[PDB]
Amino acid sequence: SHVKDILGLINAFNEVKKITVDGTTPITVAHVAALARRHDVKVALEAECRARVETCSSWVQRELQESLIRCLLAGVFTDELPATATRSAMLLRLNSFTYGCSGIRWEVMEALEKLLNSNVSPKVPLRGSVSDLIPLAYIAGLLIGKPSVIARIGDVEVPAPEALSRVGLRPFKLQAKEGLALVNGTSFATAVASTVMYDANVLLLLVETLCGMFCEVIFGREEFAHPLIHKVKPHPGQIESAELLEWLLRSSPFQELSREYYSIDKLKKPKQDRYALRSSPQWLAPLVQTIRDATTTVETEVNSANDNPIIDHANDRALHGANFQGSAVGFYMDYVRIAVAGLGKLLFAQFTELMIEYYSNGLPGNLSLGPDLSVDYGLKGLDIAMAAYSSELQYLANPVTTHVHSAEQHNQDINSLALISARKTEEALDILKLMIASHLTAMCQAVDLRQLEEALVKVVENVVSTLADECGLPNDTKARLLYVAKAVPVYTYLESPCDPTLPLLLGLKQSCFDTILALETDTLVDRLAEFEKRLSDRLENEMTAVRVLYEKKTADNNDALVRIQGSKFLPFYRFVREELDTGVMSARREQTPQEDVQKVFDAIADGRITVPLLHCLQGF
Amino acid sequence: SHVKDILGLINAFNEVKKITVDGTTPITVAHVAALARRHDVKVALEAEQCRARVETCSSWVQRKAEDELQESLIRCLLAGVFTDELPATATRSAMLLRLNSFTYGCSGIRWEVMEALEKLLNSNVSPKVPLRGSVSDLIPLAYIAGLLIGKPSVIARIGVEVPAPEALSRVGLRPFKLQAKEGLALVNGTSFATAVASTVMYDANVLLLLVETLCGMFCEVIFGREEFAHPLIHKVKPHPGQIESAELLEWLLRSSPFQELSREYYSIDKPKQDRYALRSSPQWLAPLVQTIRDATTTVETEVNSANDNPIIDHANDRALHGANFQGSAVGFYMDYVRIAVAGLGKLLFAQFTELMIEYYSNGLPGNLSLGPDLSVDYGLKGLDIAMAAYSSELQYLANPVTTHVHSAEQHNQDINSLALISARKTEEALDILKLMIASHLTAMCQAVDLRQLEEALVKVVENVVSTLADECGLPNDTKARLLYVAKAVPVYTYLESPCDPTLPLLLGLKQSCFDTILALHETDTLVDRLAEFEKRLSDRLENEMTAVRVLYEVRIQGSKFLPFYRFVREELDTGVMSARREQTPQEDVQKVFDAIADGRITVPLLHCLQGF
Amino acid sequence: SHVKDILGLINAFNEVKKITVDGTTPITVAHVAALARRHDVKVALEAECRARVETCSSWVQRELQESLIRCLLAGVFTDELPATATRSAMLLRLNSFTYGCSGIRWEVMEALEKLLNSNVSPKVPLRGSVSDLIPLAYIAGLLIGKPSVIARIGDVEVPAPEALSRVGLRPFKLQAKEGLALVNGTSFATAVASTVMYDANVLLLLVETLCGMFCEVIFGREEFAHPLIHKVKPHPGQIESAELLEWLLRSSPFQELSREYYSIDKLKKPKQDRYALRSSPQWLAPLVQTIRDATTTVETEVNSANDNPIIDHANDRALHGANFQGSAVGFYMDYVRIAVAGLGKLLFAQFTELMIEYYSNGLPGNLSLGPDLSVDYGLKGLDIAMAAYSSELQYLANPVTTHVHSAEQHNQDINSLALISARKTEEALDILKLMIASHLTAMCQAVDLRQLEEALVKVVENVVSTLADECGLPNDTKARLLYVAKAVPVYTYLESPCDPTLPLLLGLKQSCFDTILALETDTLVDRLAEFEKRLSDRLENEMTAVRVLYEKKTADNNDALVRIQGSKFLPFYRFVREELDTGVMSARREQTPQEDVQKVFDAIADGRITVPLLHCLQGF
């Protein structure tokens, strides 16, 4: 299962300490992401590929180089490629050299290892590559000590020769082929593509998992994930996503509550869920497969000699080809961007269902707690932003590779545009992170609303029950009124529970007429009138008390039951509420939606979200 | 190799007689394309393997029913408009795919309805279906359902067009009275998106292989360097599509007589490396090969699925509510294939462009114009213009459809695949790709003729120069100089007027005549003999060049691309394009296009690839 | 003419000191751009519209507000809308209020004037608007003193209530409608659209003008701009662009040189220019019209009551409509982005012709000076970047408005996405600036190469002429050899002028054989052999001397003629060479292409480019 593969990626990202660069051991996208984001991760170039590097180097030894670099130092600082992308590119260039096909000196390779481990990188302009001569020229420029090339060292910026000075290096004098060997690669496109693919895997898994949380809060039917449905339409991504969702929803206490819900007023409630949940495995299927396949493609590029000419020293020839052509990466970046847009549309559709009372099976509009809805518009602002996020995301998913210009005196009459496409896919993922942050925040709001819903219904039942006993109502009467208290969605009358025009009192009045018809008439009416009168003394205060207690909440014996404790999604709710310090959104909570969603976004952006994710998936 | 897989696909398309429909034997895109396109291919629905579960399922549904609704669903969905139609090929494919879905025994449909679909398929009866209305395929599948229930508004083709109940009469059927779940089962599938996607994928595989193969023919005519396909280059950047396309190209170009001429060309006096359109072809092809092969597996998975809802698990006495009608696997992969097809078109455009430009074609004339009189021969300029038009529309088509999901059907379908719309656009892209391939192949046959004429003409110039050098009593020094010029100067740069003193032959000869004067410095008689040489050259040279060209109007005989050249020239009855060939470019390219469209191109393709 | 209108925009941008905000005087995109970019520009709210504001305010006076703001403070800091865009939005919101339709208090309007003039603005998240509730909530948040809202003051960041403190204001307590009045506008989309349109006008005019410079350096035929061609196909933008180009090219000394060029070897040279020049007015036509029309549309929005409800106090009603809908701006932002892409394609095509010897009519490949081309690849890096720039630009020009989602509980089932589209058009313009910077830099390189070309041909002629006299060659002989010296493109043999295999000696040898044939034979040959021998003693040194002098260059009597001094494009060449301190690019010039293009880019980005532009167009 891809779920296991992604879990393995997250684990490698967390666990790696040294990246072995040796011409045989594959570098994965997790390794690339770790080097870029975790500064304690070091490069280990192993001399035991030095033999093949030096043979190729020697073979080639059998002004022109600096002129190539000068020509290519032609970008403009408008914006730059981040240091994370630049260090990634440095790693990938070094790796390309390990296969003994480039002819660069071992000493240059050692210098790259040193600069990487000392956190030295050139500042590189964002644009200029059709895929990565111009950006790679800035790395070549640092190595040869060009004064115009500025280098960061940690977070301190100096001219290139001073940067080499601080790590005990002196400017290289380039030998035959070395200039070309340094600039003639796919390092930048593939670097950005590597962290893109790492993020795509993590966020894909997060979205899949959160489909389960959506099911729990929306009162879905977990049947959509039944293995027979998917065995019979066996797209690998469809079988695997459904398999995860089936396990996530097995023995869920929210699914038990969902079953109870649909047994009440069965005829009046939807027989199937809407597509955003029911069709999630079918939808996820291509998206899973695209992201997994693109991960294999990008990693093949990471672990390639992307250079020209290719030296076959064993057979005494230089081979003229085009391993500098970033097309594998570029086409796959276009596909993944379309898949990310598809994940965004899934999230948007789910979020939309959640905000609308007609589609949320009992939840309040905008997930507004109220009770006073005139001064609580709940998550409306987040709902508007989700439309803005999806709209821009769908726009971004148009292809880049369809815009190939005939370039460089018509020499490059096909060119990959891989870096440009990878940059766009990264931008799409930024928006997907925003959409996931909002979706999870809304679902935690929904958890609270469902838990509160149950406690409020219990209060109404207790009030109806005890008042019926007090007023001396018949069994037939008590049975009917308690059914109304159980069946009427509490959020439809929470604003003013005793309002005779709102659904609770409307339901009670229907049942009161029905009990009169079914059955001392004059005394019955008097007792029903006293029931109604006492209901408006007691009910609202008791509903208020239970809600205030919930809002003000370590649980004790007075606190409302919290079904979340029995749910596999506990790690997510607890992470967002306890660890990030948030609470039910309402007019009484000072913090803005920005403040709450910002905390969730930050945790997704910096990888802290993987902790609750890994907790949730334990035992799968 | 994917190469062997595609060859397997072509062979299946050609050789299949009966499509077995049995619930276990996979139906491939070649099978779907063969049913659609070849009318001798019949459906064989096999009771022995699947009727038993079909029957148990439909009985289960009846049991639950016992413990007009269907017609009203069909009526509501007869909601298309004839503006344009889904073609009979797509509709018959849809009927096959719906029938196949039913074999898994999850649908609750009666076996007798399945027999009717087999009967209609084998008698060439299909409803007329509006093009548009599906978000993926209720509306278009309703027309199949409307035929089966004899809706008079549904028009049916037979082979002749009549209303549905009359169409049923002619195959000995009566209108069905739908049982519980049958109305839904008939309309609740991915059959039309997947049908169009199936022929799309068959065509994509064939056209991919054709493009890869023609990259080798391009190398031969453009004077490329075949080392770009060396296995070590691709071993060290091991994308499977890159390794496999290069493997084919190395084999195609090994022992090429054109590559021999190429090597000789770069030995006199010129680019050190080929431009990208050839040198970078394996790298370019890599993701395109991989996208088309992967999308073929996805489409075939859909063909062989129970795309329906609810899914009946009769064995455990329950109906499962899901969304197997969602065509997202197909829709997304149609978006990717369209981008890959645009990538194929861009490769062809780049190659064709190089071929038309004298600066980039290594000796060929601009527009591949034979002339000699270029003022009345613009050669293939019209085709060159069209290729830009083709690529431009193609790049536009490759924008995604799946990014345009609306919240549909009372917001119930808040995600939908749009797979049929996407398949239709990929089909349109492939139409354009066929046009581009036909033009490219036509141009390369022209280029073969021009290369073979070139070799013969250079020999005539050498023969003329040599013999006149003897006749005029020129020194050996002089003779060797003049002969080097006759070999070095690209003949197409002076063919228009060989003795024009401002064109490159005489310019080179005049240079050499001065060098010979300096080197040998009886001077007056030497000058007299050089003047007489120039005089006799303008009496004789053009005449003998004309004679050899008129005779023309060996090298390809040793090329792996012989089958293609012979197909286009001999079998399709064409010739080198010129002012003396009455047939328009349209007439020649139409023949090539027609052979691509109807699959006749696969014969020289398979010949070419024999023993690979 | 649109040329006059754009000149008027640039002049207003430069000249404005106070922006009158009074409900009658139009605010133009130049005023909006000036406020944003020039801090000495102040807002002047005139009390003599205060009467209508207060009447509307009073009419409305006949908790709910802060709850709206709280709900909308829902963006995430991922990136932000720049202070320039935020201050622009503040101006546009203030302007909307002046029409007396909003019901906001005059005091709130005074507060906005004060914050603008004191350089106070909230930090605003980039995304969230479908067009501008969420971003406008940050301005509303500053005004009401929300602690979570951070404000910049100059370049110093503090919480909102402290920001109000420093400008002598206290948090507002919002009255009826004021919350909605503040957030219910198109201010952000229209702000970004205003500076987009200002830049689009300036850069359009710059591109049109530079088509004339391209003609001069490429040896074009100015006939393409003849007024009859355009009178007969009378698209307004076509007539007006051709009219500019005709005037720019009238009495040009480069066009005189071009005429001489095509009189030599007439038969062998193209009879017409390629489309990048010849078709420029036809191409520019729609682009001109789109940018001008979109300027009118955006300015109408700037000068509108974009708010709801609209108060008709005169007739005692509040009118319910949708003036908050940014569709006019959004659709036009899509069109302008397509037009900007079209300008980019024009530049790319021109740049491509310039770099290729087969298309540049005598100029060297990559505009490489050499003479040693093995170590001078000239502008190749810039040529590659231009392909990268165009490719991304064409991708950006896909539409945003085609991605309308049904938003906000399906209430906003159509929405403009105007801010998103405007942001994309701004990004497209960033790339257009990069492409213009490169194009102008290449054309200055080309100016130098043409001036040098003329001086080198003069040297060859002088050497041939005097050596012919020295060696005692016949008139027939001297006449022929001087024709060769005049006709052979010097850049085809500059690498090694006496190389017998290169075009100069090839031409001389052809003519020597021709003179022998046309005409003491043995003495003639001896003199021709001595000519050739002396040519290889003298020629290269004299060509070198003239070139070195040019490179090392206030002109004196030894210096080569500089035709640029007589050209209307002098202001551009002089700006780039003298004012920005650059020179002919070559292996002997230390500065990288980055360094040279960076200077030009900076001048375009900050508006300094308008000075040479206005000089060039003086008298049109």
Side-chain angles (χ1 to χ4, degrees), chain A residues 336-354:
Chain A
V336 167
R337 198 161 57 258
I338 289 159
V340 174
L343 292 164
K345 177 45 50 86
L346 183 67
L347 296 171
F348 174 79
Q350 292 185 354
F351 199 96
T352 300
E353 296 187 1
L354 200 53

Side-chain angles (χ1 to χ4, degrees), chain A residues 393-452:
Chain A
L393 176 56
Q394 308 307 313
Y395 157 87
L396 292 174
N398 288 312
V400 162
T401 60
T402 56
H403 299 277
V404 176
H405 290 51
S406 191
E408 199 243 311
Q409 304 180 296
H410 306 299
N411 179 42
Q412 308 186 30
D413 46 7
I414 51 172
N415 55 80
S416 76
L417 305 172
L419 178 59
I420 300 163
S421 187
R423 281 178 38 235
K424 299 307 170 185
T425 304
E426 179 177 66
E427 181 172 0
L429 285 164
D430 287 339
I431 297 179
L432 193 79
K433 293 170 198 158
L434 249 16
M435 295 182 87
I436 296 159
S438 310
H439 196 48
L440 177 50
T441 301
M443 288 199 286
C444 292
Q445 178 76 356
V447 173
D448 285 322
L449 291 169
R450 289 298 194 192
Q451 298 189 144
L452 190 47

Side-chain angles (χ1 to χ4, degrees), chain A residues 223 229 232-233 235 238 272 275-276 278-279 282 290 301 305 308 320-321 323 325 327 335 345 353 411 413, chain B residues 227 233 236-237 239 273 277 279-280 283 291 302 306 309 319 321-322 324 326 328 336 354 405 412 414:
Chain A
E223 188 189 353
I229 298 167
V232 114
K233 178 160 158 162
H235 299 287
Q238 194 178 312
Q272 295 185 117
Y275 283 22
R278 180 158 49 100
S279 183
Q282 290 84 0
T290 299
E301 191 74 24
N308 193 67
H320 298 85
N323 279 355
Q325 180 73 268
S327 36
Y335 310 153
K345 177 45 50 86
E353 296 187 1
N411 179 42
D413 46 7
Chain B
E227 71 187 291
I233 295 172
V236 301
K237 179 154 160 168
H239 299 289
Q273 287 186 123
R279 175 159 55 101
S280 185
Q283 291 81 5
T291 299
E302 192 72 23
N309 193 67
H321 299 83
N324 277 356
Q326 182 73 269
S328 40
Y336 315 148
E354 289 181 15
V405 178
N412 182 47
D414 43 11

Side-chain angles (χ1 to χ4, degrees), chain A residues 389 434 594 598, chain C residues 72-82 86 122-129 134-139 149-150 152 188 419 423:
Chain A
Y389 300 156
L434 249 16
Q594 171 194 338
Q598 185 76 58
Chain C
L72 296 169
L73 295 165
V76 174
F77 293 100
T78 241
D79 275 322
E80 352 155 27
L81 283 150
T86 306
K123 293 178 79 67
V124 182
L126 182 67
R127 299 182 168 105
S129 180
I134 291 171
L136 281 173
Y138 288 82
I139 293 170
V149 176
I150 307 308
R152 321 174 225 269
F188 280 86
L419 178 59
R423 281 178 38 235

Side-chain angles (χ1 to χ4, degrees), chain C residues 179-219:
Chain C
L180 195 54
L182 284 167
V183 300
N184 224 186
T186 59
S187 313
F188 280 86
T190 312
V192 181
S194 295
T195 51
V196 156
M197 292 323 300
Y198 180 74
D199 290 344
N201 280 280
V202 173
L203 301 177
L204 165 70
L205 183 55
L206 187 51
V207 172
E208 297 189 77
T209 305
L210 290 177
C211 289
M213 188 168 189
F214 180 67
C215 187
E216 288 198 343
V217 297
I218 206 80
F219 287 174

